[PDB]
Amino acid sequence: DAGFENQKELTKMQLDNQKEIAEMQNETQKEIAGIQSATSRQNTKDQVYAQNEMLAYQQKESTARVASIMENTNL
Amino acid sequence: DAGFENQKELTKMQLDNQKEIAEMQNETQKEIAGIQSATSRQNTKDQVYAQNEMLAYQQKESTARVASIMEN
Amino acid sequence: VDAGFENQKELTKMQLDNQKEIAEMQNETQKEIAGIQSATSRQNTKDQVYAQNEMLAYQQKESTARVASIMENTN
Amino acid sequence: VDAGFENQKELTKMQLDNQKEIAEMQNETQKEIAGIQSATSRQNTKDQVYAQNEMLAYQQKESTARVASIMENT
Amino acid sequence: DAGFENQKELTKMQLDNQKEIAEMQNETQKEIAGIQSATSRQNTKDQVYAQNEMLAYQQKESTARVASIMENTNLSK
Amino acid sequence: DAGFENQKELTKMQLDNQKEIAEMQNETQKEIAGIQSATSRQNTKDQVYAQNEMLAYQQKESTARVASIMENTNLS
Amino acid sequence: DAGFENQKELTKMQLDNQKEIAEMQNETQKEIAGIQSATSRQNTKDQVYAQNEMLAYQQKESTARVASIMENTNLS
Amino acid sequence: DAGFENQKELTKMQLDNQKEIAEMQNETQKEIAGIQSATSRQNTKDQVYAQNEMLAYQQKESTARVASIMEN
Amino acid sequence: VDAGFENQKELTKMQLDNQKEIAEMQNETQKEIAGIQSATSRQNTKDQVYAQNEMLAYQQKESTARVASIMENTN
Amino acid sequence: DAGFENQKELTKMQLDNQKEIAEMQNETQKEIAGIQSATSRQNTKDQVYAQNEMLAYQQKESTARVASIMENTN
């Protein structure tokens, strides 16, 4: 049955091709997920930058306000 | 039956290949969901950082205000 | 009693079982991913409402104080 | 005499049953996922409106006190 | 004839199966849409509850302020 | 052509089934879009209710504030 | 061949049916896009209604405020 | 083969039909994208209208505020 | 040779060429739609931040005046 | 077998075509992701421009107020 070994060769060609295509698709999808994640992270960092830089100033000012308030309250 | 054992072999080869492809695809989908979840969680933490850090200060200032209100 | 037919039936069952097994694995994967998405969304929500919820008792107290002063200054 | 036909019929039937069962399983899976999404969305919403709803009665009473003051001074 | 009646039965089996699968999918899609709609509606009700409940209070207060303002204004015109 | 008319019959059975399936799918999609639209419209109405109900009060109060402000500046 | 022209007829029936099904799907999707668009436009109008109705009042009140501020200054 | 010529003819009919159906679907998706774009642009204009109309007024009021501020 | 094969090869090439063309048409369509979505998103964003950006210079000027005033009213 | 080598040529033609199609799809999807990313990044930059530009001003003003306040509580 040369027919059988031949058929096995053709079948394997097809299966190997399908597996290669699937692998490239999976890799593509993971790369795209990478890009989406990187973009989302960088976006979030850019968005929170100002509130994070204002933080220490707002804490300092709040504390000064409390000191003032309590001073006035006592007298 | 040699011929039937042969057809059975080819069939099994195809079925194993299809199953392997499905498994790699499923694993890919789970890894992507993992990336999306980690990204979403970290974005959320980054976003709520400042309000969480202002918490204790806003509480102390509210308390001070209450003392002042009750005085007046 | 048809050997050829029993053979065809066996091969057919192999393919159909494989297709079913693949379907089951895909469905399980989809359900697990939905579980991940759910867990993440819930934890995100908890993280977001944390500050809100923590300020609640203080805001109620301060509102009560404002009312105390308002009513005292009325009549 | 129609044995070949009854055989082809049996095979076709096996395939069709299998397809219908797979569709049924996919459909049930989608329904279950929708239930999960709905439950999560409902609970998220409850968690979000909690603070609002707890402040409500205070905001109403403070408004009423303000009104009493305004009307005295009017 | 015989082969044809046979063939027509096989064909009909496939067509009926495909139609049933399509109907099951349509019903499933509609059920899911019903769940999403009910959920969205209930979420919206929960969200607008507080502002709706503040409405009458804000209206009464605004009216009070208007009365006070207009009085304070009219006393000098 | 007997066999050919039989062929046309089987073929048309297929074509009609496919057209019926497609028609029912299209109807389903339209119904779902109708539900989504109705839901979105009602959600929107519920959300803007308070806003809209406060409108006349806010306008009246604003006009009052303007009268007050202007009276005070044409005082001093 | 007569067998040919017959086969061509069957083929044509199939192709025409596939084209018709596709066309009805396209029309369905366009109708749904039309519903989504109309719903989104009306939602947006409902949402911005209060904003837009308050606009003139906020403008007049700002103008009054500015006149007040200018009056209360002592210079120029 | 005359049979081959006929076969090639049926094939071409099928391939052309598939290409036309694909073309019609693509045109449909693009028209829908056009509708979505036009809708989103108009929604955005409607939304920012009030903002943009308050601009000149807020700018004037800020300027007056500055004149008051530096006078004390 | 095998003329039947040459025929078969031609038919197969017609089909493959067709499939590839259809795939290219779809890829190009998806890219054009991405272009439309991006241009729309960019213009929407510009329209949205217009007011913000136009108030910037006034808010900066006013803040600067406030700083100077604070310095003058500080002992 | 010449017949086998022929079938092998047809098979390979089909498989190569399928691989080329998949590659073109993958490339297209990557390109679209790139457009979406560039767009989202530029949108974000446009959005945060104003608050970033106000930052230094708000910091200086905060410092001034704090100095004033602290001097006053003494």
Side-chain angles (χ1 to χ4, degrees):
Chain A
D1 227 320
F4 181 55
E5 290 290 309
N6 285 340
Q7 188 179 22
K8 191 188 308 176
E9 185 178 354
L10 297 171
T11 305
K12 282 170 126 309
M13 288 173 55
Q14 292 161 329
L15 301 180
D16 289 350
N17 198 250
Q18 294 167 340
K19 166 121 66 184
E20 283 152 23
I21 287 174
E23 288 175 350
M24 286 180 298
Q25 276 157 5
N26 295 347
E27 180 54 39
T28 301
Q29 292 165 355
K30 290 172 191 178
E31 295 176 12
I32 292 175
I35 300 174
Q36 289 165 338
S37 177
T39 301
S40 179
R41 291 296 297 129
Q42 189 53 63
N43 283 352
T44 297
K45 291 175 186 179
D46 283 1
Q47 292 283 354
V48 305
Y49 176 76
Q51 66 203 51
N52 288 354
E53 295 288 316
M54 277 311 304
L55 199 54
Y57 293 83
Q58 295 167 326
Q59 292 165 335
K60 206 143 311 182
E61 193 175 342
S62 178
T63 298
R65 265 185 241 116
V66 173
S68 170
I69 289 174
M70 287 176 57
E71 190 82 276
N72 291 23
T73 290
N74 249 250
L75 70 73
Chain B
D1 193 348
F4 173 62
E5 281 305 322
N6 286 341
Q7 217 59 13
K8 196 176 175 187
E9 185 198 356
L10 287 170
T11 306
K12 168 119 192 305
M13 239 188 318
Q14 298 164 305
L15 300 179
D16 290 343
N17 203 69
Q18 283 169 314
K19 185 167 275 186
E20 292 156 28
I21 287 172
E23 293 170 348
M24 299 183 291
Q25 290 166 337
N26 292 342
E27 171 61 19
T28 299
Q29 290 172 5
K30 295 188 237 202
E31 291 180 14
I32 288 163
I35 291 171
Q36 294 163 335
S37 168
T39 297
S40 178
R41 287 294 300 130
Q42 192 54 59
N43 280 353
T44 297
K45 295 174 175 173
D46 283 4
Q47 293 283 357
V48 303
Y49 176 78
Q51 65 204 46
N52 285 357
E53 294 298 307
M54 285 304 302
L55 229 33
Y57 296 82
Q58 293 160 332
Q59 293 166 347
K60 292 172 187 171
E61 198 173 348
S62 174
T63 301
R65 284 186 225 113
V66 169
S68 180
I69 294 170
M70 295 303 296
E71 205 63 68
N72 295 311
Chain C
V1 310
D2 186 336
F5 176 65
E6 293 310 309
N7 287 346
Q8 288 311 123
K9 193 176 168 182
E10 178 174 356
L11 293 169
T12 306
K13 174 170 180 53
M14 292 172 61
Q15 299 168 309
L16 299 180
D17 285 350
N18 200 71
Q19 289 169 313
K20 184 204 73 198
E21 288 155 12
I22 291 173
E24 292 168 333
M25 289 180 299
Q26 186 199 52
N27 294 337
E28 179 174 7
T29 300
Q30 292 169 13
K31 280 253 286 188
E32 292 177 15
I33 287 173
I36 294 174
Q37 284 164 343
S38 176
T40 301
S41 175
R42 293 289 303 123
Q43 188 61 57
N44 281 354
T45 299
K46 294 177 194 182
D47 284 356
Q48 291 158 353
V49 304
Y50 180 75
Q52 226 151 105
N53 289 351
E54 291 294 316
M55 286 310 302
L56 196 65
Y58 294 87
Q59 287 160 342
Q60 297 168 330
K61 177 169 167 184
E62 190 174 346
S63 179
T64 302
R66 273 179 237 120
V67 168
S69 182
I70 292 163
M71 300 185 67
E72 201 226 87
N73 285 282
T74 306
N75 279 319
Chain D
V1 67
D2 67 333
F5 168 68
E6 289 295 315
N7 286 347
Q8 186 55 244
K9 188 185 180 191
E10 186 174 3
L11 294 172
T12 303
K13 155 122 286 215
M14 295 168 64
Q15 304 182 309
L16 298 181
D17 285 351
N18 206 68
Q19 289 162 350
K20 185 184 293 192
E21 296 162 10
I22 288 173
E24 281 163 9
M25 279 177 297
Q26 179 71 70
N27 292 342
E28 174 61 19
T29 301
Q30 293 173 350
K31 291 181 199 186
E32 290 170 10
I33 291 173
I36 288 173
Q37 290 163 334
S38 164
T40 297
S41 173
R42 287 297 297 132
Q43 186 58 64
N44 281 352
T45 296
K46 295 174 180 167
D47 287 354
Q48 283 155 359
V49 303
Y50 177 75
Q52 248 149 265
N53 288 358
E54 292 300 305
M55 284 306 299
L56 180 55
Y58 291 84
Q59 292 161 333
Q60 294 172 329
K61 293 187 185 63
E62 192 176 341
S63 177
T64 302
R66 283 191 225 102
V67 173
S69 188
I70 295 165
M71 287 183 168
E72 184 211 16
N73 306 342
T74 282
Chain E
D1 189 309
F4 174 67
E5 226 52 51
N6 283 0
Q7 188 75 14
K8 189 176 175 182
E9 188 183 2
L10 285 181
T11 304
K12 189 186 184 312
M13 293 175 50
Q14 290 169 46
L15 301 183
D16 291 339
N17 203 71
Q18 291 168 348
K19 179 117 87 179
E20 287 160 354
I21 289 164
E23 284 168 340
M24 288 182 277
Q25 182 185 76
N26 295 346
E27 194 168 10
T28 304
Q29 285 166 3
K30 294 175 176 187
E31 290 157 2
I32 288 176
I35 290 171
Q36 295 166 333
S37 171
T39 300
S40 178
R41 289 296 299 132
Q42 193 52 65
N43 287 345
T44 299
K45 293 176 189 174
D46 289 351
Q47 291 163 341
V48 305
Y49 177 77
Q51 68 205 44
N52 286 354
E53 291 295 326
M54 278 307 295
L55 208 54
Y57 293 82
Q58 292 157 342
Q59 288 171 340
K60 189 165 191 198
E61 194 176 349
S62 174
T63 304
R65 288 191 225 102
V66 166
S68 177
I69 295 171
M70 289 183 73
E71 177 177 281
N72 298 16
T73 303
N74 288 337
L75 56 53
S76 286
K77 281 185 290 196
Chain F
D1 250 315
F4 173 67
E5 260 38 68
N6 285 358
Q7 230 48 50
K8 251 189 68 181
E9 189 178 349
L10 300 165
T11 299
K12 185 191 169 197
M13 296 194 318
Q14 298 211 9
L15 300 177
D16 291 338
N17 200 72
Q18 290 166 336
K19 194 167 201 159
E20 290 155 18
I21 284 168
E23 154 69 9
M24 295 186 307
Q25 280 158 350
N26 299 344
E27 288 196 351
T28 301
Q29 290 168 318
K30 286 176 211 179
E31 283 169 40
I32 289 168
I35 295 173
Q36 288 161 340
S37 176
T39 298
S40 179
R41 288 294 299 128
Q42 191 61 52
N43 280 350
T44 297
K45 294 182 193 178
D46 288 356
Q47 288 162 349
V48 312
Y49 180 81
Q51 230 151 101
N52 294 353
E53 286 300 311
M54 284 305 298
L55 208 58
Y57 294 84
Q58 288 163 333
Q59 299 171 334
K60 186 166 186 175
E61 188 172 355
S62 176
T63 297
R65 284 189 219 103
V66 171
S68 177
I69 289 167
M70 300 184 313
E71 171 70 12
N72 292 11
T73 87
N74 254 38
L75 231 56
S76 53
Chain G
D1 185 14
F4 173 65
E5 286 291 332
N6 281 1
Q7 190 74 5
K8 173 164 184 174
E9 182 181 329
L10 292 175
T11 302
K12 163 80 152 40
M13 303 194 319
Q14 295 174 315
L15 298 179
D16 287 345
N17 195 254
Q18 286 156 21
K19 190 172 180 295
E20 289 160 13
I21 284 173
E23 169 62 15
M24 291 320 285
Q25 289 162 342
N26 296 345
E27 293 185 18
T28 298
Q29 287 167 10
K30 276 139 74 170
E31 291 174 14
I32 290 170
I35 296 175
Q36 289 165 339
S37 175
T39 294
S40 177
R41 288 299 294 129
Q42 191 56 64
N43 280 353
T44 301
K45 294 172 181 172
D46 284 358
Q47 291 169 343
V48 302
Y49 179 74
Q51 234 146 101
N52 291 346
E53 294 293 311
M54 283 306 302
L55 183 56
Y57 293 86
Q58 292 159 337
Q59 289 169 338
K60 291 174 184 174
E61 190 170 351
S62 177
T63 300
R65 250 179 258 118
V66 170
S68 185
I69 296 176
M70 299 306 275
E71 171 72 24
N72 197 29
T73 66
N74 305 309
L75 269 49
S76 315
Chain H
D1 214 83
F4 168 66
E5 210 42 69
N6 292 0
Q7 183 180 11
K8 183 176 163 193
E9 183 185 347
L10 302 175
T11 304
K12 183 176 196 308
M13 294 195 300
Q14 289 168 341
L15 295 179
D16 288 341
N17 200 246
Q18 290 167 340
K19 192 153 52 171
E20 287 149 29
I21 284 169
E23 173 65 31
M24 291 187 295
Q25 284 158 347
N26 293 342
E27 294 183 7
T28 299
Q29 295 164 3
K30 284 186 272 186
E31 293 167 24
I32 290 176
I35 292 172
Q36 280 160 345
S37 170
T39 297
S40 172
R41 291 291 300 123
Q42 191 56 57
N43 284 348
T44 299
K45 296 168 174 172
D46 285 351
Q47 288 164 343
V48 308
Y49 175 75
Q51 242 153 267
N52 293 352
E53 289 297 329
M54 285 301 293
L55 233 38
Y57 294 86
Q58 298 160 321
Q59 292 170 345
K60 274 166 169 298
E61 197 166 345
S62 176
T63 298
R65 272 183 238 124
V66 170
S68 189
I69 284 172
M70 294 194 301
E71 206 183 280
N72 268 303
Chain I
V1 288
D2 198 343
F5 175 67
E6 303 182 325
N7 288 344
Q8 183 86 326
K9 181 177 175 175
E10 184 177 352
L11 297 166
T12 304
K13 192 201 193 307
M14 300 183 319
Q15 301 168 350
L16 295 174
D17 287 340
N18 202 250
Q19 290 162 15
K20 185 192 299 181
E21 188 176 354
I22 286 171
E24 295 173 7
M25 288 156 59
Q26 181 183 84
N27 290 343
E28 292 301 321
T29 298
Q30 283 167 0
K31 282 190 280 171
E32 288 172 3
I33 291 172
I36 295 177
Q37 289 163 337
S38 170
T40 301
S41 181
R42 290 293 298 130
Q43 194 55 65
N44 283 351
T45 297
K46 291 178 188 165
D47 287 345
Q48 286 162 351
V49 308
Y50 179 78
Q52 227 153 102
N53 292 353
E54 288 296 310
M55 287 305 302
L56 191 59
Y58 294 84
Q59 290 160 329
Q60 291 174 337
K61 209 163 180 164
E62 191 176 337
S63 174
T64 293
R66 272 186 243 117
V67 171
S69 173
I70 293 177
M71 302 295 290
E72 305 287 357
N73 284 291
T74 299
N75 101 86
Chain J
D1 194 30
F4 173 64
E5 282 305 306
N6 282 348
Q7 264 303 128
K8 186 170 171 178
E9 184 184 1
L10 286 170
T11 310
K12 188 178 146 48
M13 282 166 71
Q14 295 153 321
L15 298 170
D16 289 338
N17 199 67
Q18 288 166 5
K19 183 139 99 183
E20 175 172 15
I21 286 172
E23 287 172 14
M24 288 183 302
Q25 177 176 328
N26 294 344
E27 167 65 14
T28 297
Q29 292 168 193
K30 289 185 208 178
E31 280 175 324
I32 294 176
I35 295 163
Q36 289 166 335
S37 172
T39 298
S40 177
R41 287 292 304 134
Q42 193 55 60
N43 282 354
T44 299
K45 289 173 184 171
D46 287 351
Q47 285 158 343
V48 302
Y49 179 75
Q51 69 205 41
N52 287 358
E53 291 294 308
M54 282 305 295
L55 190 60
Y57 291 86
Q58 288 159 336
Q59 292 166 339
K60 293 177 163 187
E61 190 178 337
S62 180
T63 298
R65 294 189 216 105
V66 169
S68 171
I69 292 172
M70 289 201 290
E71 174 179 277
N72 258 359
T73 98
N74 290 338

